[PDB]
Design an enzyme around this catalytic site. Structure first.
Site, PDB file in Angstrom:
ATOM      1  N   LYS A   4      10.108  27.694   1.711  1.00 24.22           N
ATOM      2  CA  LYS A   4      10.550  26.677   2.665  1.00 24.22           C
ATOM      3  C   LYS A   4      10.728  27.201   4.084  1.00 24.22           C
ATOM      4  CE  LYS A   4      10.416  23.575   0.846  1.00 24.22           C
ATOM      5  NZ  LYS A   4       9.061  23.002   0.553  1.00 24.22           N
ATOM      6  N   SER A   5       9.952  28.210   4.445  1.00 20.73           N
ATOM      7  CA  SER A   5      10.093  28.814   5.758  1.00 20.73           C
ATOM      8  C   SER A   5       8.959  28.396   6.691  1.00 20.73           C
ATOM      9  CB  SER A   5      10.148  30.341   5.629  1.00 20.73           C
ATOM     10  OG  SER A   5      11.252  30.738   4.826  1.00 20.73           O
ATOM     11  N   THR A  14       3.343  26.242   4.656  1.00 18.00           N
ATOM     12  CA  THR A  14       2.263  25.285   4.720  1.00 18.00           C
ATOM     13  C   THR A  14       1.757  25.203   6.150  1.00 18.00           C
ATOM     14  OG1 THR A  14       3.403  24.082   2.968  1.00 18.00           O
ATOM     15  CG2 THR A  14       1.547  22.960   4.055  1.00 18.00           C
ATOM     16  N   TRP A  15       2.687  25.302   7.091  1.00 21.31           N
ATOM     17  CA  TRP A  15       2.375  25.231   8.507  1.00 21.31           C
ATOM     18  C   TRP A  15       1.462  26.378   8.933  1.00 21.31           C
ATOM     19  CZ3 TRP A  15       6.649  25.198  12.898  1.00 21.31           C
ATOM     20  CH2 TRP A  15       6.057  24.761  14.094  1.00 21.31           C
ATOM     21  N   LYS A  41      -1.569  32.843  -0.622  1.00 29.60           N
ATOM     22  CA  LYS A  41      -0.177  32.470  -0.401  1.00 29.60           C
ATOM     23  C   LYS A  41       0.735  33.161  -1.420  1.00 29.60           C
ATOM     24  CE  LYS A  41       3.020  28.701  -1.380  1.00 29.60           C
ATOM     25  NZ  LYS A  41       3.245  27.277  -1.736  1.00 29.60           N
ATOM     26  N   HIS A  45       5.238  34.131  -2.207  1.00 33.06           N
ATOM     27  CA  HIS A  45       6.616  34.181  -1.755  1.00 33.06           C
ATOM     28  C   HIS A  45       7.278  35.506  -2.126  1.00 33.06           C
ATOM     29  CE1 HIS A  45       6.452  30.085  -0.420  1.00 33.06           C
ATOM     30  NE2 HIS A  45       6.415  29.558  -1.633  1.00 33.06           N
ATOM     31  N   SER A  61      16.318  23.013   3.435  1.00 29.92           N
ATOM     32  CA  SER A  61      14.986  22.651   2.958  1.00 29.92           C
ATOM     33  C   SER A  61      14.825  22.933   1.464  1.00 29.92           C
ATOM     34  CB  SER A  61      13.919  23.418   3.757  1.00 29.92           C
ATOM     35  OG  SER A  61      12.607  22.994   3.409  1.00 29.92           O
ATOM     36  N   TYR A  67       9.569  30.953  12.354  1.00 29.03           N
ATOM     37  CA  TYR A  67       9.389  29.513  12.376  1.00 29.03           C
ATOM     38  C   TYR A  67       9.848  28.951  13.716  1.00 29.03           C
ATOM     39  CZ  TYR A  67      10.032  24.621  10.987  1.00 29.03           C
ATOM     40  OH  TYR A  67       9.982  23.256  10.913  1.00 29.03           O
ATOM     41  N   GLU A  70       0.845  15.136  12.361  1.00 21.29           N
ATOM     42  CA  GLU A  70      -0.496  15.134  11.786  1.00 21.29           C
ATOM     43  C   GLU A  70      -0.488  15.624  10.348  1.00 21.29           C
ATOM     44  OE1 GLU A  70      -3.380  13.638  13.247  1.00 21.29           O
ATOM     45  OE2 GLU A  70      -4.211  15.438  14.211  1.00 21.29           O
ATOM     46  N   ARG A 104       9.344  17.047   5.441  1.00 17.10           N
ATOM     47  CA  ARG A 104      10.616  16.339   5.448  1.00 17.10           C
ATOM     48  C   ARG A 104      11.100  15.970   6.851  1.00 17.10           C
ATOM     49  NH1 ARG A 104      16.028  17.519   5.622  1.00 17.10           N
ATOM     50  NH2 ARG A 104      15.385  19.616   6.293  1.00 17.10           N
TER      51      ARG A 104
HETATM   52  N1  LIG Z   1       3.277  21.355  10.978  1.00 19.47           N
HETATM   53  C1  LIG Z   1       4.664  21.608  10.757  1.00 19.47           C
HETATM   54  N2  LIG Z   1       5.553  21.678  11.864  1.00 19.47           N
HETATM   55  C2  LIG Z   1       6.946  21.926  11.687  1.00 19.47           C
HETATM   56  N3  LIG Z   1       7.491  22.114  10.384  1.00 19.47           N
HETATM   57  C3  LIG Z   1       6.654  22.057   9.235  1.00 19.47           C
HETATM   58  C4  LIG Z   1       5.203  21.801   9.387  1.00 19.47           C
HETATM   59  N4  LIG Z   1       4.641  21.798   8.076  1.00 19.47           N
HETATM   60  C5  LIG Z   1       5.693  22.044   7.135  1.00 19.47           C
HETATM   61  N5  LIG Z   1       6.916  22.211   7.850  1.00 19.47           N
HETATM   62  C6  LIG Z   1       8.209  22.448   7.301  1.00 19.47           C
HETATM   63  O1  LIG Z   1       8.297  23.606   6.563  1.00 19.47           O
HETATM   64  C7  LIG Z   1       9.131  23.376   5.480  1.00 19.47           C
HETATM   65  C8  LIG Z   1       8.350  23.597   4.221  1.00 19.47           C
HETATM   66  O2  LIG Z   1       8.094  24.949   4.109  1.00 19.47           O
HETATM   67  P1  LIG Z   1       7.078  25.542   3.069  1.00 19.47           P
HETATM   68  O3  LIG Z   1       5.648  25.110   3.469  1.00 19.47           O
HETATM   69  O4  LIG Z   1       7.214  27.088   3.160  1.00 19.47           O
HETATM   70  O5  LIG Z   1       7.393  25.043   1.639  1.00 19.47           O
HETATM   71  C9  LIG Z   1       9.642  21.977   5.585  1.00 19.47           C
HETATM   72  O6  LIG Z   1      10.794  22.013   6.337  1.00 19.47           O
HETATM   73  P2  LIG Z   1      11.925  20.916   6.306  1.00 19.47           P
HETATM   74  O7  LIG Z   1      12.289  20.596   4.839  1.00 19.47           O
HETATM   75  O8  LIG Z   1      13.170  21.433   7.068  1.00 19.47           O
HETATM   76  O9  LIG Z   1      11.354  19.658   7.030  1.00 19.47           O
HETATM   77  C10 LIG Z   1       8.527  21.363   6.344  1.00 19.47           C
HETATM   78  O10 LIG Z   1       8.849  20.189   6.980  1.00 19.47           O
HETATM   79  C1  LIG Z   2       6.789  26.373  -8.684  1.00 23.05           C
HETATM   80  C2  LIG Z   2       6.734  25.088  -7.854  1.00 23.05           C
HETATM   81  C3  LIG Z   2       8.087  24.417  -8.072  1.00 23.05           C
HETATM   82  C4  LIG Z   2       6.507  25.444  -6.399  1.00 23.05           C
HETATM   83  C5  LIG Z   2       5.527  24.906  -5.594  1.00 23.05           C
HETATM   84  C6  LIG Z   2       5.433  25.352  -4.277  1.00 23.05           C
HETATM   85 BR1  LIG Z   2       4.259  24.570  -3.001  1.00 23.05          BR
HETATM   86  C7  LIG Z   2       6.291  26.326  -3.754  1.00 23.05           C
HETATM   87  O1  LIG Z   2       6.123  26.874  -2.473  1.00 23.05           O
HETATM   88  C8  LIG Z   2       7.216  26.870  -4.623  1.00 23.05           C
HETATM   89 BR2  LIG Z   2       8.513  28.063  -3.968  1.00 23.05          BR
HETATM   90  C9  LIG Z   2       7.332  26.401  -5.895  1.00 23.05           C
HETATM   91  C10 LIG Z   2       5.643  24.215  -8.406  1.00 23.05           C
HETATM   92  C11 LIG Z   2       5.764  22.840  -8.249  1.00 23.05           C
HETATM   93  C12 LIG Z   2       4.803  21.962  -8.771  1.00 23.05           C
HETATM   94 BR3  LIG Z   2       4.942  20.033  -8.586  1.00 23.05          BR
HETATM   95  C13 LIG Z   2       3.708  22.540  -9.452  1.00 23.05           C
HETATM   96  O2  LIG Z   2       2.740  21.712  -9.945  1.00 23.05           O
HETATM   97  C14 LIG Z   2       3.574  23.944  -9.632  1.00 23.05           C
HETATM   98 BR4  LIG Z   2       2.049  24.627 -10.608  1.00 23.05          BR
HETATM   99  C15 LIG Z   2       4.569  24.791  -9.099  1.00 23.05           C
END
Ligand SMILES: Nc1ncnc2c1ncn2[C@@H]1O[C@H](COP(=O)(O)O)[C@@H](OP(=O)(O)O)[C@H]1O
Ligand SMILES: CC(C)(c1cc(Br)c(O)c(Br)c1)c1cc(Br)c(O)c(Br)c1
Ligand code: NA
EC number: 2.8.2.4
Length: 292
Positions: free
Chosen positions: A46-47, A50-51, A104, A106, A136, A191, A229, A255
């Site tokens: 959650k850091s 994806t971004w 990817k 963690h 998050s 971030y 986007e 989110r």
């Molecule tokens: N293009 C973007 N710009 C800013 N934050 C982004 C983003 N894409 C994903 N995030 C944020 O990154 C977090 C998800 O992280 P991860 O990809 O490591 O699981 C979420 O934070 P929040 O839940 O605070 O909104 C998500 O909104």
């Molecule tokens: C393991 C977990 C919860 C997960 C997804 C992401 Br994306 C994360 O960044 C991290 Br942390 C954990 C997950 C969730 C779903 Br639904 C799935 O189908 C599978 Br396969 C794995």
């Protein structure tokens, strides 16, 4: 019952708490074979994984948006250690993947498969302030199957402070990667810096990956990877996953995408408790974060 919940969902591997489904086949991760041109994107959950992943993918594709939308992100950039028996398999996805691979993970540096270090693969590490991560991760527990009921936010934060959540201590994670980030092969990002000045970090990323940073390419990356986007892009917002595994009706994956949402969740007392603990954890490190 809450403790029982955690026991059923998580198991330790190398001293690190982990999703039980991943651990069952950890030998596959342990013996994973890197290639020299692999790129690792490593983060605490959650850091902003994806971004930065999408930014990196655009850099690889020289800003060709169609190429980025040809398949969902979790297929374009396999999640290394992730495994659901035979339903999902990150290692398999990588094995069959044509290079150059983007991986990817963690994992803390001590758990990264040895092959990545042996072949000296470039690694990009992204971190985010602990409070925002906690918020998050809390919603993530709520939305996604395979998590115990996180209880109340203060209850969850207590588990967070003790590192009793998947991937263990955020404190140790970031501190360990910070040491590795001194290596020229490891690019250490925040971030909060991507929020503050996206252009500066994108250009930094382009140079690290040895590509050419044109205005047009940089501009394409900036708008394609903006929160609004990506939130609407089914390739990057995980909405192709069914509700029974990821229930975005409770809380979307994309989110809020801000820095400082912790101000909306921590009470004054929790903030005080968290801050005191944080100082003790982080005093012996030159790593400095911004909470705003
Ligand atoms: N293009 C973007 N710009 C800013 N934050 C982004 C983003 N894409 C994903 N995030 C944020 O990154 C977090 C998800 O992280 P991860 O990809 O490591 O699981 C979420 O934070 P929040 O839940 O605070 O909104 C998500 O909104
Ligand atoms: C393991 C977990 C919860 C997960 C997804 C992401 Br994306 C994360 O960044 C991290 Br942390 C954990 C997950 C969730 C779903 Br639904 C799935 O189908 C599978 Br396969 C794995
Ligand atoms: Na470095």
């Amino acid at each position: 019952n809450s403790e029982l919940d955690y026991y059923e969902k998580f198991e330790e591997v190398h001293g690190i708490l982990m999703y039980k489904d991943f651990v069952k086949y950890w030998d596959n991760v342990e013996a994973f074979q890197a290639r020299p041109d692999d790129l690792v994107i490593a983060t605490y959950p959650k850091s902003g994984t994806t971004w930065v992943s999408e930014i990196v993918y655009m850099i690889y594709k020289e800003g060709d948006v169609e190429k980025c939308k040809e398949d969902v992100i979790f297929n374009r950039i396999p999640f290394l250690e992730c495994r659901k028996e035979n339903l999902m398999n990150g290692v398999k996805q990588l094995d069959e993947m044509n290079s150059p691979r983007i991986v990817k993970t963690h994992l803390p540096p001590e758990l990264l498969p040895a092959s990545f270090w042996e072949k000296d693969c470039k690694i990009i590490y992204l971190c985010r302030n602990a409070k925002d991560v906690a918020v998050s991760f809390y919603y993530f527990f709520l939305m996604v199957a395979g998590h115990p009921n996180p209880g109340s936010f203060p209850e969850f934060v207590e588990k967070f402070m003790q590192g009793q959540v998947p991937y263990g201590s955020w404190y140790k994670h970031v501190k360990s990667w910070w040491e590795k980030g001194k290596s020229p092969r490891v690019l250490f990002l925040f971030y909060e810096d991507l929020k503050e000045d996206i252009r500066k970090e994108v250009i930094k990323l382009i140079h690290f990956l040895e590509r050419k940073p044109s205005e047009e390419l940089v501009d394409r990356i900036i708008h394609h990877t903006s929160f609004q986007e990506m939130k609407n892009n089914p390739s990057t917002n995980y909405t192709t996953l069914p509700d029974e595994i990821m229930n975005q009706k409770l809380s979307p994956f994309m989110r809020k995408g801000i820095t400082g949402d912790w101000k909306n969740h921590f009470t004054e007392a929790l903030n005080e408790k968290f801050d005191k603990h944080y100082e003790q954890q982080m005093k012996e490190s030159t790593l400095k974060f911004r909470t705003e």
